[PDB]
């Protein structure tokens, strides 16, 4: 009888609750919401973050980060998505990915794993794109797992391991750093105009080692700019950063009179400005919890080197600003550090005059309840930069909620051109 | 406080007061409909107003919304054609499953 | 026992909901005025399924 061809703008409420938990230094999705082209989106999240109960009182605060991204479906499917919308009703169904059989094999995607073992691929593919563009180190290779079932238990359960806060050892110079550059002069002659050309080519190589390892960085150096559709990267909408604090509880019985237990409870807000959605896609929110990288057995570089030369100590501007980067070992910074090839990296020529490390007294070593890196970070450069959550197990009491937990309410309001429920159920 | 305005009683009878206590219906193993269906067609995802407002109600199963949900006749019911674009469910992490002290519908 | 707060599964469409409605057209012909009458009777049935059961 009466065929409907259009719809008014209606206020849709997409608010819901979230019960979240995770580990230290792993990225995990906490909320998502699919969107349609032409929508007007707004988000506001309010909740409280908690850590597991501590073995002692409060010593060090933790840092919490919240992120929101928008990913069009065209970035995930490509040409398949283009033909999908042009065909219309008789379009081919989109491809899928395979998941595991347990209930928690997709916890990093913020959803319960369906019993069928099959789910759409836009959440898994959007997670990889975010990680490879914003969170991993620029010099390490991308993650290219095809299906969620290809991950190990740790990655699927809690998320991918992220990088420590920047220090001398956790933010070294990239591995493709050269300390020498050779030329092909003659046996008894040299071209000096050719020498000038050699320095010019070395300058462009050093630019791409320190600043420009991505395509959008190269364009930015010329003074241009690239849209997020040019390099197929997710669009960041909002970032929030805050510190979590709490209070202490005192024991009052015979045995525990004089000891204390700390609990962390912090309220937060994550507000995203109004956004106009240009195409069909998804909007995802993620969280990250980290501690400042304090190590017990770390000392000053001048203390660790022992025998000091004029270059080390004088701080002469002519020598500091004209020498190639120096290669140092982990032994020079940590007790029992290594000397082999895997314990070697390169730093600035006088970096020790621009920072001072933190000191932990030997009375605090091997003491439960203090969030510390006991000893030194182990492994090669890749394992040294990435955070390992199992090293923080000595700070918390064993519980089923991991190392941190939160409860938040996401206030989502969208203006959508969709027919009402009454229109959908009445034939005439 | 429960205050009732003044009332004129027209005939013999009784006046009764009752109480009801409920929790919001949050289930641990519940997921989005688009996640549970898996293979998505143009009708499911495009949100085209012509198709949304002119199609008969769709029948879905409990499997499409809950883990280990059923498929038989007793686990089937009917919803609006694009109801999943008008609401979003709550998420409970797997660490909270089978944990005493949280008012939840387990499963 | 009372009912849960309204959700997608706790507030479904009533069990007397039809997804089809048949007519008795001819073998090679159809009355189109009769077709208009069929839609009118379907509208009153859907009113009593969704809104007016009391």
């Amino acid at each position: 009888s009466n065929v409907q061809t259009s719809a008014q703008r209606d206020r849709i409420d997409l608010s819901h609750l979230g019960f979240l938990s995770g580990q230290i230094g792993r990225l995990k999705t906490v909320s998502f919401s699919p969107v349609i082209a032409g929508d007007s989106f707004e988000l506001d999240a309010v909740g409280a973050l908690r850590l597991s109960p501590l073995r002692r009182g409060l010593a060090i605060d933790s840092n919490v980060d919240y992120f929101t991204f928008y990913i069009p479906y065209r970035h995930v499917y490509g040409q398949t998505w283009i033909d999908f919308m042009k065909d219309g009703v008789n379009a081919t169904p989109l491809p899928t990915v395979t998941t595991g059989i347990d209930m928690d094999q997709t916890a990093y995607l913020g959803t319960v794993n369906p019993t069928s073992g099959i789910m759409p691929k836009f959440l898994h593919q959007s997670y990889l794109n975010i990680y490879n563009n914003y969170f991993k180190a620029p010099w390490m290779p991308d993650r290219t797992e095809a299906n969620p079932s290809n991950l190990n238990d740790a990655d699927s359960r809690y998320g991918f391991r992220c990088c420590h806060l920047k220090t001398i050892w956790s933010a070294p110079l990239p591995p493709q750093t050269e300390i020498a550059r050779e030329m092909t002069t003659g046996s008894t002659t040299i071209d000096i105009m050719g020498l000038q050309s050699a320095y010019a080519k070395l300058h462009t190589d050093q630019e791409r080692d320190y600043f420009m390892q991505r395509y959008r960085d190269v364009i930015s150096s010329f003074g241009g700019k690239t849209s997020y559709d040019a390099d197929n990267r997710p669009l960041l909408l909002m970032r929030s950063n805050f510190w979590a604090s709490g209070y202490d509880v005192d024991g009052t019985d015979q045995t525990s009179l004089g000891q204390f237990s700390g609990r962390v409870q912090q309220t937060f807000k994550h507000a995203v400005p109004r956004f106009f959605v240009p195409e069909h896609g998804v909007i995802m929110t993620l969280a990250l919890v980290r501690f400042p990288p304090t190590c017990t057995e770390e000392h000053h570089y001048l203390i660790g080197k022992g025998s000091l030369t004029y270059t080390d100590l004088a701080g002469d501007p002519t020598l500091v600003g004209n020498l190639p980067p120096r290669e140092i070992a982990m032994e020079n910074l940590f007790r029992s550090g290594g000397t082999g090839t895997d314990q070697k990296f390169k730093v600035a020529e006088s970096i020790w005059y621009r920072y001072h490390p933190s000191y932990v007294d030997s009375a605090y070593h091997l003491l439960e309840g203090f969030p510390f890196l006991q000893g030194r970070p182990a492994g090669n450069m890749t394992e040294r930069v990435l955070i390992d959550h199992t090293k923080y197990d000595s700070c918390f009491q064993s519980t089923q909620l991991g190392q941190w937990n939160a409860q938040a309410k996401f206030n989502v309001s969208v203006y959508r051109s969709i027919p009402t429920v009454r229109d959908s159920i009445m034939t005439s | 406080k429960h205050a009732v305005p003044r009332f004129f009683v027209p005939e013999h009878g009784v006046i009764m007061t009752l109480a009801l206590v409920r929790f919001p219906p949050t289930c641990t193993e519940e997921h989005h409909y688009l996640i549970g269906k898996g293979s998505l067609t143009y009708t499911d995802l495009a949100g085209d107003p012509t198709l949304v407002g002119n199609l008969p109600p769709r029948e879905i199963a409990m499997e499409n919304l809950f883990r280990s949900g059923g498929t038989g006749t007793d686990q089937k019911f009917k919803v609006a054609e694009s109801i999943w674009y008008r609401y979003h469910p709550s998420y409970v992490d797997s660490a909270y499953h089978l944990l005493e002290g949280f008012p939840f519908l387990q499963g | 026992r009372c009912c849960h707060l309204k959700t997608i599964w706790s507030a479904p469409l009533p069990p007397q909901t039809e997804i089809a409605r048949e007519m008795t057209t001819g073998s090679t012909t159809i009355d189109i005025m009769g077709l208009q009458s069929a839609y009118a009777k379907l509208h009153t049935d859907q009113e009593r399924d969704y809104f007016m059961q009391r």
Binding site: R11, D13, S15, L17, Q407, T420, V421 | - | A11, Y50, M52
Partner: peptide, 26 residues
């Protein structure tokens, strides 16, 4: 100690009706 994220399961309803069960239900 916690109002918004402990009271209710969603946001305020300012829009079209979503549920039709055949009449009033409480």
């Amino acid at each position: 100690m916690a109002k918004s994220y402990r009271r209710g399961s969603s946001g305020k309803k300012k829009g079209s009706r979503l549920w039709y069960v055949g009449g009033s239900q409480f």
